[PDB]
Amino acid sequence: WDYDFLQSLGRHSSVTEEHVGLAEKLKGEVKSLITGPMEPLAKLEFIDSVRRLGLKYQFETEMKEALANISYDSWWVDNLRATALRFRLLRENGIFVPQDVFERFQNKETGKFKNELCEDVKGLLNLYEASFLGWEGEDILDEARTFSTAQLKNVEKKISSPNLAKIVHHALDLPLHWRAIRYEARWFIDIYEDEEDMNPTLLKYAKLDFNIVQSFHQAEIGRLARWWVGTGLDKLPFARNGLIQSYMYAIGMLFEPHLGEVREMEAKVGALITTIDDVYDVYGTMEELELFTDITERWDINRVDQLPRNIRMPLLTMFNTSNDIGYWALKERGFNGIPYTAKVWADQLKSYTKEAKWFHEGHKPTLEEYLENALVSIGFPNLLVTSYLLTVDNPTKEKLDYVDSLPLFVRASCILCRIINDLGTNLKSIQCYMNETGASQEVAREHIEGLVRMWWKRLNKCLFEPSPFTEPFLSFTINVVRGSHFFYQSWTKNQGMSVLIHPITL
Ligand SMILES: [Mg+2]
Numbered sequence: 001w002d003y004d005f006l007q008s009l010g011r012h013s014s015v016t017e018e019h020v021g022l023a024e025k026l027k028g029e030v031k032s033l034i035t036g037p038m039e040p041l042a043k044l045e046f047i048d049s050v051r052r053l054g055l056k057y058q059f060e061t062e063m064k065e066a067l068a069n070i071s072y073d074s075w076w077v078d079n080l081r082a083t084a085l086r087f088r089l090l091r092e093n094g095i096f097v098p099q100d101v102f103e104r105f106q107n108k109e110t111g112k113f114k115n116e117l118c119e120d121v122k123g124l125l126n127l128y129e130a131s132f133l134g135w136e137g138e139d140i141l142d143e144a145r146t147f148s149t150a151q152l153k154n155v156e157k158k159i160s161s162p163n164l165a166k167i168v169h170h171a172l173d174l175p176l177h178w179r180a181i182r183y184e185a186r187w188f189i190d191i192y193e194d195e196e197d198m199n200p201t202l203l204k205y206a207k208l209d210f211n212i213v214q215s216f217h218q219a220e221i222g223r224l225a226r227w228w229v230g231t232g233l234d235k236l237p238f239a240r241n242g243l244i245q246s247y248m249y250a251i252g253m254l255f256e257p258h259l260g261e262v263r264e265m266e267a268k269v270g271a272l273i274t275t276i277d278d279v280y281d282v283y284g285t286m287e288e289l290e291l292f293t294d295i296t297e298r299w300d301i302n303r304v305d306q307l308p309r310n311i312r313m314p315l316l317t318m319f320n321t322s323n324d325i326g327y328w329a330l331k332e333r334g335f336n337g338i339p340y341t342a343k344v345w346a347d348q349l350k351s352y353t354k355e356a357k358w359f360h361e362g363h364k365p366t367l368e369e370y371l372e373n374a375l376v377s378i379g380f381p382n383l384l385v386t387s388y389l390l391t392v393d394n395p396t397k398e399k400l401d402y403v404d405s406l407p408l409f410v411r412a413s414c415i416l417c418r419i420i421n422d423l424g425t426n427l428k429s430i431q432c433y434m435n436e437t438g439a440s441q442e443v444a445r446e447h448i449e450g451l452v453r454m455w456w457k458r459l460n461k462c463l464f465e466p467s468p469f470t471e472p473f474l475s476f477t478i479n480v481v482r483g484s485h486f487f488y489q490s491w492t493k494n495q496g497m498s499v500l501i502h503p504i505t506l
């Protein structure tokens with residue numbers, strides 16, 4: 001967490017031409033395996049492994065085709081383990097599978113899962129993971145969640161294989177569906193190695209690809225670190241280590257090398273959001289904040305000198321950065337994005353002002369009122385719209401306008417990030433609920449957790465509906481949520497060193 005160290009990064013890369021060469025050789029082999037004949041359950045398992053290792057970006061097409069072909073039922077209809085894995089993978093890849101596929105395993109009278117299945121751990125694990133792919137009203141899945149969760153909790157201590165035990169403990173903490181991809185990949189690499197049926201070729205490739213991707217991140221980090229010091233925001237009292245935290249968060253949103261420029265831009269915005277949050281929350285005067293907001297709405301800087309230095313610098317950095325991001329869009333994408341960057345920052349500042357205002361005037365909002373504002377203040381509408389502006393094919397005023405309106409797919413993601421943040425961490429989601437219902441601290445928290453689950457189902461359903469959206473925006477929307485879950489469970493320092501700094505030994 002030292003800037004001199006960070007700035008240094010990217011200067012010297014661990015990877016070698018030898019490493020690169022071996023990687024492309026290995027990739028082809030993995031491609032062969034993915035498309036090659038294999039027992040069906042094994043293939044599903046292999047494909048799942050590829051995703052878990054963070055390699056889906058590499059083989060998205062081969063993977064889809066393999067699943068498509070897989071979509072002769074003898075291999076899976078008979079066993080729940082196969083059924084659940086099949087259900088999850090198909091759904092994750094856009095192939096619908098009805099929940100009724102799980103009925104045979106239920107007691108018809110009770111509608112409950114047979115106690116007989118609790119003995120096999122993998123069976124329970126697949127069922128549990130598969131349940132997070134459910135939509136609203138899919139009660140079978142909801143039943144599967146509570147059943148598998150309870151069983152897994154019961155059987156965790158009865159497990160003898162330590163590796164399996166680690167996996168179960170990991171799943172109970174967070175299902176795979178909710179885990180940030182890059183981070184999960186690092187953890188899994190070590191785990192996969194110890195699996196009995198592990199494929200050495202995939203593992204090797206996973207290690208190589210990780211190191212290679214990492215080198216790109218290291219280079220990105222160095223530039224960002226130099227940029228941050230250049231702004232001078234590093235010497236400001238607020239937001240210590242905001243940049244690295246922001247970059248780490250962005251890694252969760254997008255980790256791919258081909259998206260490095262976009263990632264760097266997201267990281268800059270993230271760092272600013274964090275710093276400005278502190279300006280509004282702690283440092284600034286209402287008079288100062290209202291001015292900060294007004295200057296932003298107008299995108300007019302005539303009055304900036306009115307503000308004190310500690311506030312003026314963050315305001316100018318936000319202004320300059322937004323202009324730069326907007327310009328990049330004009331240059332690379334042939335579409336001036338400044339109006340859009342400016343607008344989402346205006347909305348964001350307004351959300352902050354409102355919170356500051358409630359706080360300076362003693363208002364206590366209801367949960368819906370708080371959330372209506374808070375989904376905006378978390379900063380995700382800003383991050384996502386910007387992300388859209390920089391990646392969408394043939395951008396237009398109309399497209400940007402639709403995204404900025406916060407349709408359900410986007411809105412759901414923003415709400416989730418906010419609630420996830422509040423659960424992990426004046427007045428937040430829980431207190432607002434307590435007051436609306438007077439409910440207990442424990443009961444309210446339970447209620448919020450319910451919202452998370454509810455919102456995810458909606459997000460899951462949105463993926464199957466017709467949409468204006470395409471990759472990579474669809475992924476960004478889902479990924480920011482995962483990023484939120486990861487950050488809100490010194491533990492960040494360990495994740496930083498393991499994923500960004502230290503290469504995997506070969
Ligand atoms: Mg705040």
Ligand SMILES: [Mg+2]
Pocket residue numbers: 301302
């Ligand atoms: Mg001027």
